[PDB]
Design a protein around this ligand. Structure first.
Ligand code: GSH
Ligand code: GSH
Lengths: 223, 223
């Protein structure tokens, strides 16, 4: 039984889980809980961080004793699963578009993370006003790149379609208004939400839209 | 004639340039300068940013009219060049270790960037203290992973060796002391610095260890 380990957060792990659900691959979900308020300690992880044989101990991690796989980097994990299930590029031309979108998606995660995890309230407002300036342009870039395609690379679904759903959804829940004039991307999310196994996943009583981030974060973090 | 476009900083562009020098590929370096103090305007870039036909306009970017390549994501760019010059994995097993190291290297960049660019003074101090706490453990992980290997993956150099060089060097310049319990990595930097074409590149009258970061940054922004 392959094992995916992560916090009880959508976070970075959700794209991987969406891919797994889509591809029908069975896995055990190993979840870690933070400690109580007001410090939300990571003892649950830190007591085991070095006992799993991981080279670069981190969450998330992916372990498959049967295939001798033991990894710990989100993008490395998802690319590995994508390669296995044929959800990668088939030309160098496709691979370029895909890896750009991958990296554009990760860029959105870093700009969102640097704000949502900000401790100072005054700095949070500066970071947010600043984000509200930056994000429309990124979403328009994505809409343009997508055009009238069903998925980001065409009518074939790729691993970055799952990486883009999660981050776009998180942003959506942060501020609907950012999508007020982006029906193209809202239509795209709805297309993904209607893939059978995704519908199944989002319907599960395990699934909840929040928490997205850790309990120490200003946005998300709170069921 | 391929064009690589970046600021006149080492930042995310340097790994790509180290690879290009190593592989003997000819390129034009298109550099952008910041404005005068104390605003350091980005006009040189922003005047032109959306007029280059890039899908996700950003620095760095890579353009090759001849092969119809036009990209804007550092990891995507370097992987593209790696694929073309055979500096990628030769099994899925190698590719896993490579992409882990890639992502571990990018993790180091995001930790150091979130600190060196910190707009607040109190948070900068906390982030620097947090960094000093986090980093020894990461470097030790890298030293262990490397062991008695000449390069990070083994005896064949890959693109993630150039990624790892740059970020380890930047960290070295930030605080030597961080390498006290992981001295294996200083030998590794020396091995990289002695590859013929790298030696050539680092010996150039155009090469300087600083500036690493932009001039608005709290560390690394001064030649
Ligand atoms: N909630 C964040 C991600 C949180 C997360 O996964 N953090 C990781 C670091 S990449 C972690 O806690 N690692 C465990 C450790 O500290 O060793 C998001 O939505 O992007
Ligand atoms: N010097 C920083 C990176 C600085 C950098 O390259 N910034 C990029 C962000 S990807 C930039 O200026 N891009 C913004 C743009 O092109 O508009 C480092 O240590 O890596």
């Amino acid at each position: 039984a392959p094992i995916l380990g992560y916090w009880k957060l959508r976070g970075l792990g959700e794209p991987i889980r969406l891919l797994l659900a889509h591809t029908g691959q069975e896995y055990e979900m190993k979840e870690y809980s933070f400690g109580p308020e007001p410090d939300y300690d990571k003892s649950e992880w830190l007591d085991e961080k070095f006992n799993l044989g991981l080279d670069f101990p981190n969450l998330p991690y992916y372990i498959d004793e049967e295939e001798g796989v033991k990894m710990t980097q989100t993008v490395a994990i998802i690319r590995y699963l994508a390669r296995k299930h044929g959800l990668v590029g088939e030309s160098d031309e496709e691979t370029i578009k895909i890896e750009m979108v991958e990296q554009q998606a990760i860029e959105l995660i870093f700009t969102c993370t640097r704000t949502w995890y900000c401790r100072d309230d005054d700095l949070f407002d500066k970071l947010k006003e600043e984000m509200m300036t930056i994000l429309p342009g990124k979403l328009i870039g994505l809409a343009k790149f997508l055009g009238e395609n069903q998925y980001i690379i065409g009518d074939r679904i790729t691993y970055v379609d799952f990486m883009l759903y999660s981050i776009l959804d998180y942003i959506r829940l942060f501020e609907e208004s950012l999508f007020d004039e982006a029906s193209s991307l809202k239509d795209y999310l709805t297309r993904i939400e209607s893939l059978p196994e995704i519908e199944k996943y989002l319907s599960s009583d395990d699934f909840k839209r929040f928490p997205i981030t850790g309990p120490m974060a200003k946005f998300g973090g709170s069921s």
